Amino acid sequence: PMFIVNTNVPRASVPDGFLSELTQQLAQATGKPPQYIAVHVVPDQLMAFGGSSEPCALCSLHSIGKIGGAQNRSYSKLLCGLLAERLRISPDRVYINYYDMNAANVGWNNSTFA
Amino acid sequence: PMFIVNTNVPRASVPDGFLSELTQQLAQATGKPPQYIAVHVVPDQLMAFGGSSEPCALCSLHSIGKIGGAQNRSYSKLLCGLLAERLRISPDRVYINYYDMNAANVGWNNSTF
Amino acid sequence: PMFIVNTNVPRASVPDGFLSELTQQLAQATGKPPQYIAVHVVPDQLMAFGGSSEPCALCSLHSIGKIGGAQNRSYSKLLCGLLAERLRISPDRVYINYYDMNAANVGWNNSTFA
Known part of the structure; x- marks a missing residue:
């Protein structure tokens, strides 16, 4: 599972430890x-949401399996909460795209996960 | 809908109100x-198109529905037109990947659609 | 075909010619x-892989066709090979998402490839 955050929050507003926190929390959430x-995490971005440049985020979570109606709802509560607490971004200014990847469509270590 | 542009055009060449025009131009096309x-918009990127570092763009448009043959043609004419007009990028040096997102696969405001 | 690499390796560590080498090698590999x-290529990124900030990459390869199990394994060997040789990233610290795009879903030159 791969989590990418793109935001207009500045780099200095990303707390030390945020990458490890995401890592740990996603390990709990995906099992x-x-x-x-x-x-x-990609700060300092030139972005708008609803026409506004108030703090916002565009994110993606890719996983091989572990993607679904209820799972995605849970992941969105978790990740919006983290973005709200740590980056001070309102949950209604976050979009997270979920992708259920086929194992054959993920390369790693000179091969794929098939 | 969510539109992302990555381009080698420099930041100084992105004019005022660019984001704002995109948003308005986009509301209209999708419904x-x-x-x-x-x-x-992500300027100042290290990219090539056709082996050339002349201005170019790689873009994505995600939507829950409102994606299809004719619609994507229309969006392409719209967006290539703006990138040409505002960022001086030739239309034949732009790629736009369209994604029809399932509502269950878009998160927002602690839940999904 | 479109290849994107996001890496925490710094800009100065991307060698001259790398965009051309990638272009040439992908021309040969995709036909x-x-x-x-x-x-x-996007250097200097704030990334972690496996809870480590050692060199890593998150990549995508989009293609209209030319995507599948054996092809993707071949691409992964090639592309991890280049990332190890040129950017000193270990192949087990790379993910590459492969996408088989429909022609009607790729815009170019005011229209699509359909």
Whole structure:
């Protein structure tokens, strides 16, 4: 599972430890070992949401399985909460795209996960 | 709907109100209110198109529905037109990936659609 | 075909010619003229892989066709190979998401490829 956050919050507003927190929390939420989890945060972005440049985020969570109606609702509560607490972004200014990847469509270690 | 542009055009070349035009231009085409449109522009990128570092863009438009053959054609003419007009990028140096998102696969405001 | 690499390796560590090498190698690997190939490298990223900030990459390869189990394994060997050789990223610290795009879902030159 791979989590990417793109935001207009500045770099200095991203707390030390945020990447590890995401890692740990996603390992709890996906039930995957943290060794398999990748996280990526992109601050200082030129973005708008509803026409406004107030703090906002555009995110993606890719996983091989563990994607679904209820699961995605749970992930959205978790990740919006983290973005709200740590980056001071309102949950109604976050979008998170979920992608259920086929194992054959994820490369790693000179091959794929098929 | 969410539109993302990545481009090698420099930041200084992105004019005032660019994000704002995108958002308005986009509300119209999709049948969505501006309130909900998200836009993202990423200048100063290290990219090539056709092996050339002349101005170019790689973009994504995500929507829950309102994606299809004719619609994507129309969006393409719209967005290529703006990128050409505002960022001086030739239309034949732009790629736009369209994604029809399932509502259950879009999160927002602690839940999904 | 479109290849994107997001990495925490710094800009100065991306060697001269890398965008051209990627373009050339993907032309050979996909069977597609170089004029159709787009490449994008994003250094200096705030990333973690497996709860570590050692060099890593998160990548995507989009193609209209030319995507599948054996092809993707081949692409992963090639692309991890380049990332290890040129950017000193270990292949087990790379993910590559593969996307088989429908022609009607790729815009270009005021229209789509459909």
